[PDB]
Amino acid sequence: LTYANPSNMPSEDYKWGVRVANLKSIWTAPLPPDTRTSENMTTGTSTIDIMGLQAAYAKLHTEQERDYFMTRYRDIMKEFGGHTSYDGDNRPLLLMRSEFWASGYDVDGTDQSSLGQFSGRVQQTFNHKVPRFYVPEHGVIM
Amino acid sequence: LTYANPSNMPSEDYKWGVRVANLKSIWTAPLPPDTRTSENMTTGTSTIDIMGLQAAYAKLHTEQERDYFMTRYRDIMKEFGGHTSYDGDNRPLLLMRSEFWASGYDVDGTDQSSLGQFSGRVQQTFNHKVPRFYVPEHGVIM
């Protein structure tokens, strides 16, 4: 999202915020669309290079990995056994994360017409704790 | 060195002796020059034999090994899990081996002109011990 100014983002993207991804299903987490279903190695007319073939496989491997898991530098790095500071790739630092399921209770209708009818009331008490944190430089915590 | 007589070997080869190999570097221990950089398998025009290919790889393997490590019978044998007497391949038997680094000291010049000048003097005491050895047959110990 290379939006320059909020006056550039879709009305509802900046009203309620941009759309997050659905929870992993089979159809809701397809393989990367640019995912190769085949790979050609230009061969000779009546011979193939047994050693070239080998190599062909080594390259496709490196490609496949980038496609499926290391689409991120910080990611192609980690698989090298190294690490990259959130300062190497200018990524906001995730300080804390809370997740929970919100619930509530049903309200029973009791008049002549809506007796046997209910309305679910979702009241969920939650709490989130961001442990003390040392701010290296000036910035915002979102 | 298939020299017949010393009158056949180069002047300096038989004056001071034949040249030994440099100490392993990157450029001083290249891969065998006859080392294959590719290997063709003659394929059909619009099909390859998936099983033939497999085989192709088995042969190249045996070739590659001979090229890199078993250029010697006694060597292609050892990788079979066997052994060959120095009598199987008529090789001189290495009885003892000593290796060391020779050093010395510098001599300080002290006249008007060579005061601040030095000459390195390499005096190295060494010793070599050939443990007792049972001579099976008549021969020379070099």
Side-chain angles (χ1 to χ4, degrees):
Chain A
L1 280 65
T2 230
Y3 298 141
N5 304 68
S7 203
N8 297 195
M9 297 182 303
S11 186
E12 273 223 342
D13 263 1
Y14 76 51
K15 269 215 160 156
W16 303 111
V18 39
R19 309 161 55 189
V20 77
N22 263 186
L23 296 186
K24 268 156 232 221
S25 144
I26 185 145
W27 53 269
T28 231
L31 273 179
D34 283 21
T35 295
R36 312 185 163 174
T37 183
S38 78
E39 195 80 5
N40 318 181
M41 161 170 140
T42 145
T43 195
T45 249
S46 199
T47 187
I48 170 102
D49 178 355
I50 274 339
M51 293 185 41
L53 184 49
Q54 209 41 209
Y57 278 115
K59 318 184 181 207
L60 170 64
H61 191 264
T62 84
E63 274 178 3
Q64 285 193 152
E65 263 179 325
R66 308 224 192 269
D67 290 301
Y68 298 140
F69 336 108
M70 313 156 342
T71 185
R72 236 96 148 210
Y73 171 72
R74 75 173 168 257
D75 275 342
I76 117 172
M77 209 51 157
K78 177 176 183 185
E79 162 99 306
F80 259 96
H83 181 268
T84 148
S85 83
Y86 67 81
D87 267 344
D89 71 345
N90 249 24
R91 59 180 182 269
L93 164 81
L94 202 235
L95 294 162
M96 183 54 243
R97 190 197 155 159
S98 309
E99 167 181 3
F100 73 96
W101 295 96
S103 203
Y105 68 98
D106 284 338
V107 178
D108 296 3
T110 81
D111 65 345
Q112 157 171 218
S113 193
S114 65
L115 181 53
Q117 196 184 320
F118 314 84
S119 189
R121 207 208 169 154
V122 175
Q123 301 200 103
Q124 198 41 250
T125 291
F126 73 82
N127 177 173
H128 186 69
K129 225 146 170 191
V130 174
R132 181 170 311 206
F133 168 88
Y134 179 71
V135 184
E137 324 183 57
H138 288 63
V140 72
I141 298 160
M142 281 199 206
Chain B
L1 280 65
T2 230
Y3 298 141
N5 304 68
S7 203
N8 297 195
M9 297 182 303
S11 186
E12 273 223 342
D13 263 1
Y14 76 51
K15 269 215 160 156
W16 303 111
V18 39
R19 309 161 55 189
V20 77
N22 263 186
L23 296 186
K24 268 156 232 221
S25 144
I26 185 145
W27 53 269
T28 231
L31 273 179
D34 283 21
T35 295
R36 312 185 163 174
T37 183
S38 78
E39 195 80 5
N40 318 181
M41 161 170 140
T42 145
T43 195
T45 249
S46 199
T47 187
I48 170 102
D49 178 355
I50 274 339
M51 293 185 41
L53 184 49
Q54 209 41 209
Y57 278 115
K59 318 184 181 207
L60 170 64
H61 191 264
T62 84
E63 274 178 3
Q64 285 193 152
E65 263 179 325
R66 308 224 192 269
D67 290 301
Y68 298 140
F69 336 108
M70 313 156 342
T71 185
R72 236 96 148 210
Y73 171 72
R74 75 173 168 257
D75 275 342
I76 117 172
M77 209 51 157
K78 177 176 183 185
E79 162 99 306
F80 259 96
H83 181 268
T84 148
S85 83
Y86 67 81
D87 267 344
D89 71 345
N90 249 24
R91 59 180 182 269
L93 164 81
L94 202 235
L95 294 162
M96 183 54 243
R97 190 197 155 159
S98 309
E99 167 181 3
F100 73 96
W101 295 96
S103 203
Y105 68 98
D106 284 338
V107 178
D108 296 3
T110 81
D111 65 345
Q112 157 171 218
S113 193
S114 65
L115 181 53
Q117 196 184 320
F118 314 84
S119 189
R121 207 208 169 154
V122 175
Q123 301 200 103
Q124 198 41 250
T125 291
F126 73 82
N127 177 173
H128 186 69
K129 225 146 170 191
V130 174
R132 181 170 311 206
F133 168 88
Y134 179 71
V135 184
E137 324 183 57
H138 288 63
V140 72
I141 298 159
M142 281 199 206

